[PDB]
Ligand binder design. Structure first.
Ligand SMILES: Cc1ccnc2c1NC(=O)c1cccnc1N2C1CC1
Ligand SMILES: [Mn+2]
Lengths: 555, 412
RNA sequence: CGGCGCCCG
RNA sequence: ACAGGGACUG
DNA sequence: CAGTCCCTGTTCGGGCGCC
């Protein structure tokens, strides 16, 4: 007889599959003689057993190394068993962000020892565990055994651990409503607004409750260690910060340097306000090798500079005070880049961040703002579970005009205007109705698919005509091109009539920036003009002076 | 201790592994208090990591209600139980339900908590109550009883339902009663006073047979269809003739007897848009004959039960929305318009959420089926707030669309 | 070896 | 990598 | 009809930021 610590969680196998039988795979020759002994230890503790006949099971060994150890950590490879083992609902959905934590007066960390080997494996599944690994080099053929607990590198070790531990904690917690716990791996962090000593009262009383379940809590445990260092974070009960960031000063610039660079800037951007990656990010476009050589442009360096000066002075985040409102304010940073700060009390920030993503082939500041506002709302719901007060560089009339004209359903939640320049504006509007006393340019364009060759032009009510030959082009590009001409050759006020569904779709969505130089130019001409009217008439319907410019360019 | 109707994921497909989306703290409180109380009632119970299945859940308050109703998005499960409900047991859809002067919708879903569920199936109803900021892990449950909003729940309860109702149908034969998922549709030509009385009465029926029921009226006899109509003009600019002609070209995709010939000829030279061109008589008559073909129905558009319905919504501006229901292009089963819905003039997503609900509703009263939406919205916008404005116990299917406005010409 | 988050086909 | 829409091929 | 492309916008295989 062995003994029985804590409730076991049933595990099946993907129906119609069975335990593995495998040949060994290389692992370093020196440390493994040690486990021959360590194995006998486990025999006595209940973490191992053996039987001769019943196991058609064998597993190899493949491992991962960790820095900062005063002792070596053993491993075994169940990968064949793994692939053959039922799936679980993973318990780690990702991790809480510091800015979502409430400030807690007292916060301690107990690190659970022998955590994975402290959890009973499912009785009947125990069978599938049998394994073998080289003695020192090797001499005689060998022997084998079975596992009584959660094995290293097994899938359920993490799932079942997390759940069992949680299951254990539930009754302490129900008995202690005003404590606050969080579990990451084998470490537990506990915190309260109670007084420092009675807090330590419950800290021992809990090391008690864990012991009552066979869970070890050493005294290497620290009330005196905080800040706790966790995943790039430094956490004190009063204030949090990113762990110190080292920005490369290298004279030599390879694309992998710029990569690590960018990732680092964004990670800084969660806390240090106003980080810009745009120009550094332009270098990265369409490169074959991660080891290639790239020079830095002047803009990207003036930016890298401003950023280095951002990192110069230190910074810290506050924590969330659920009693008080959440405020998120976005300032337009230009080049389709955006920044935001979320604070409650002014100038004490919970966090910052960037939204730079240029979304779409042609876009504008209203669309893009709407996007930043959505990103932030989503993030806010993840962390604080609520939506912020918006402080937005946009007049309530700017915005109203946009969302109310636009064909898509679009919305920003409750928000208030902040008059911080540059302010977001609509750079042109298309008229909703034809313009009296403007020339009417009937415009068309066509190209030939085979030759990729073509022409763009127009006819007007005034007799004015034009046709321009174009090389290496498409039907679409010519229809944009003809509308363009009609913009160029027209007065301040002009009516433009086009037959292209494509072109009309772009312009009518009022882009202020585009990937396409021709659209940028169209946009530019558009801003200059006092009034524009875009009209659509079906092709080859024998329309208007539309049949005429269609003839003119199809020739 | 009563039987349990075994249930099966139609052959080949696994249980829903679909992920739980992040919730507001508000809604997480309401869900926690509802599941702990419902666990206490043994409707649901806690589960472990051995059940690797999930259905997403959130919560809503029904229209005009300050009490929180839990809502599970069982769409994925319903897709994976489907052959079971559709192929095994069919439910005839009353064609008269739509003709009734009033139709009330009562939420009977609570009754579903009576019947047990096949112990072998329960592992597929697994749903996570999320935690804010991932401070705790999820509280995972699974449904012990017949889970609200799964298509099997209204299916399996069919016998019992037809039973409890048989007294009323027998006493009131002229009253039409239809059932779609967690909702029950009841309608009659009675004057509203006595209708509401017959409704309170039916409420009693299900009340004494052991059910609780936390206005709902619809007026299907009043539902109007929006036909396409060409403008009435005193005097015509060129531009008018052009937009007219373009529209005519579309309608001619729908009604084939349309001709643009004489209006096109009206456009003959290269003319200023705003110049005023008089209507020739031959054209005046082609146009009036067109205004005619547009008062007709469309030959050969009829509902085919086997086909999925598809519903398209266009945003027309200024609180207006147009919609069209069809199973196949250009053969439209219904066209319509909504205005001054909640959110009008301030929040588009709200209005749209409303439109999707009203449309699904007419769709259920008429064909007994929820439509597939094409939503004139960005995917992400929609996911964020659609979860915020939802008052219905069901969830239609949707996909996201971009059609800068030339079909916006479904209304002047 | 993975999870989580961005950038390129 | 996948889909929707346009337009041209007899 | 299918069968061609031209243009545009969300899922998966490369690599950096955090374990
Ligand atoms: C790393 C971590 C993750 C999640 N929560 C906590 C912690 N540890 C803390 O440093 C912490 C700090 C301040 C307040 N709560 C904290 N806690 C909460 C549990 C009391
Ligand atoms: Mn053309």
């Amino acid at each position: 007889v062995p003994i029985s610590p804590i409730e076991t969680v049933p595990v099946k196998l993907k129906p119609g599959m069975d335990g593995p039988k495998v040949k060994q795979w290389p692992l370093t020759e020196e440390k493994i003689k040690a486990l021959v002994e360590i194995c006998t230890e486990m025999e006595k503790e209940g973490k191992i057993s053996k039987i001769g006949p019943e196991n058609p099971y064998n597993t190899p060994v493949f491992a991962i190394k960790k820095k900062d150890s005063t002792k070596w950590r053993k491993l075994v490879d169940f990968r064949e068993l793994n692939k053959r083992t039922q799936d679980f609902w993973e318990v780690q959905l990702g991790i809480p962000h510091p800015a979502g934590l409430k400030k807690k007066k007292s916060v301690t960390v107990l690190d659970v020892g022998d955590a994975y080997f402290s959890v009973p494996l499912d009785e009947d599944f125990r069978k599938y565990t049998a394994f073998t690994i080289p003695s020192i080099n090797n001499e005689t053929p060998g022997i084998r055994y079975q596992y009584n607990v959660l094995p290293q590198g097994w899938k359920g070790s993490p799932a079942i651990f997390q759940s069992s531990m949680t299951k254990i904690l539930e009754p302490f917690k129900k008995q202690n409503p005003d404590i606050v716990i969080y579990q990451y791996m084998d470490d537990l962090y506990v915190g309260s607004d109670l007084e420092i000593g009675q807090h330590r009262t419950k800290i021992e009383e809990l090391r008690q409750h864990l012991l009552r379940w066979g869970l070890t809590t050493p005294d290497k445990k620290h009330q005196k260690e905080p800040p706790f260092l966790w995943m790039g974070y430094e956490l004190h009960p009063d204030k949090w910060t990113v762990q110190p960031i080292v920005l490369p000063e290298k004279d030599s610039w390879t694309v992998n340097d710029i990569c690590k660079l960018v990732g680092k800037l964004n990670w800084a951007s969660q806390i240090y306000p106003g980080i810009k990656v745009r120009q550094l990010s332009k270098l990265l476009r369409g490169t074959k090798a991660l080891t290639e050589v790239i020079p830095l442009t002047e803009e990207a360096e003036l930016e890298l500079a401003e950023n280095r000066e951002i990192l110069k002075e230190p910074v810290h985040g506050v924590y969330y005070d659920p009693s008080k409102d959440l405020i998120a304010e976005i300032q337009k940073q230009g080049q389709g880049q955006w920044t935001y700060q979320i604070y409650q009390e002014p100038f004490k920030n919970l966090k910052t961040g960037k939204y730079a993503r240029m979304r779409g082939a042609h876009t504008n500041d209203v669309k893009q703002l709407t996007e930043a506002v959505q990103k932030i709302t989503t993030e806010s719901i993840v962390i604080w579970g609520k939506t912020p007060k918006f402080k937005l560089p946009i007049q309530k009339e700017t915005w109203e005009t946009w969302w109310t004209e636009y064909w898509q359903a679009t919305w920003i939640p409750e928000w208030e205007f902040v008059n911080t320049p540059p302010l977001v504006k609509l750079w042109y509007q298309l008229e909703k109705e034809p313009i009296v006393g403007a020339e009417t340019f009937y415009v068309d364009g066509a190209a030939n698919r085979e030759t990729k060759l073509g022409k763009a032009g127009y006819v007007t009510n005034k007799g004015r005509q034009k046709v321009v030959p174009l090389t290496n082009t498409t039907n679409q590009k010519t229809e944009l091109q003809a509308i363009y001409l009609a913009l160029q050759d027209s007065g301040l006020e002009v009516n433009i009539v086009t037959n292209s569904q494509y072109a009309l779709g772009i312009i009518q969505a009022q882009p202020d920036k585009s990937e396409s130089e021709l659209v940028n130019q169209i946009i530019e001409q558009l801003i200059k003009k006092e009034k524009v009217y875009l009209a659509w008439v079906p092709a080859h319907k024998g329309i208007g002076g539309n049949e005429q410019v269609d003839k003119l360019v199809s020739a | 201790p009563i039987e349990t109707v075994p249930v099966k994921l139609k052959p080949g497909m696994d249980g829903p592994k679909v992920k739980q989306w992040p919730l507001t703290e508000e809604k997480i409180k309401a869900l926690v208090e509802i599941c702990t109380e419902m666990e206490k009632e043994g409707k649901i119970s806690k589960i472990g990591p051995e059940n690797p299945y999930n259905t997403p859940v959130f919560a809503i308050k029904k229209k005009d209600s300050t009490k929180w109703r839990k809502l599970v998005d069982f769409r994925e499960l319903n897709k994976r139980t489907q052959d079971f409900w559709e192929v095994q047991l069919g439910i005839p859809h009353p064609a008269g339900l739509k003709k009734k002067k009033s139709v009330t919708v009562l939420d009977v879903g609570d009754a579903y908590f009576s019947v047990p569920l096949d112990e072998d199936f329960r592992k597929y109803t697994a749903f996570t109550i999320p935690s804010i900021n991932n401070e705790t892990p999820g509280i995972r449950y699974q449904y012990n009883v017949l889970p609200q909003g799964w298509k099997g729940s209204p299916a399996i309860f069919q016998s019992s339902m037809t039973k409890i109702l048989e007294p009323f149908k027998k006493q009131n034969p002229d009253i039409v009663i239809y059932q779609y998922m967690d909702d029950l549709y009841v309608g009659s030509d009675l004057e509203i006073g006595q209708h509401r009385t017959k409704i309170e009465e039916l409420r009693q029926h299900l009340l004494r047979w052991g059910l609780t029921t936390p206005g709902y009226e619809l007026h299907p006899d009043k539902w109007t269809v929006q036909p396409i109509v060409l403008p009435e003009k005193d005097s015509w600019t060129v531009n008018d003739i052009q937009k007219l002609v373009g529209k005519l070209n579309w309608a001619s995709q729908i009604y084939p007897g349309i001709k643009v010939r004489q209006l096109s000829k009206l456009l003959r030279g290269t003319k200023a848009l705003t110049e005023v061109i008089p209507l020739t008589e031959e054209a005046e008559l082609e146009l009036a004959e067109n205004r005619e073909i547009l008062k007709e129905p469309v030959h050969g558009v009829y509902y085919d039960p086997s086909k999925d319905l598809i519903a398209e919504i266009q945003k027309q501006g200024q609180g207006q929305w147009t919609y069209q229901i069809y199973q196949e292009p250009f053969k439209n089963l219904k066209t319509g318009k909504y205005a001054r819905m909640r959110g009008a003039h301030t929040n588009d997503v709200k209005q749209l959420t409303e439109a999707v609900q009203k449309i699904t509703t007419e769709s259920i009263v008429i064909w007994g089926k929820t439509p597939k939406f094409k939503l004139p919205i960005q995917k992400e916008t929609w996911e964020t707030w659609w979860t915020e404005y939802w008052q219905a116990t069901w969830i239609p299917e949707w996909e996201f669309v971009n059609t800068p406005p030339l079909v916006k010409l479904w209304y002047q």
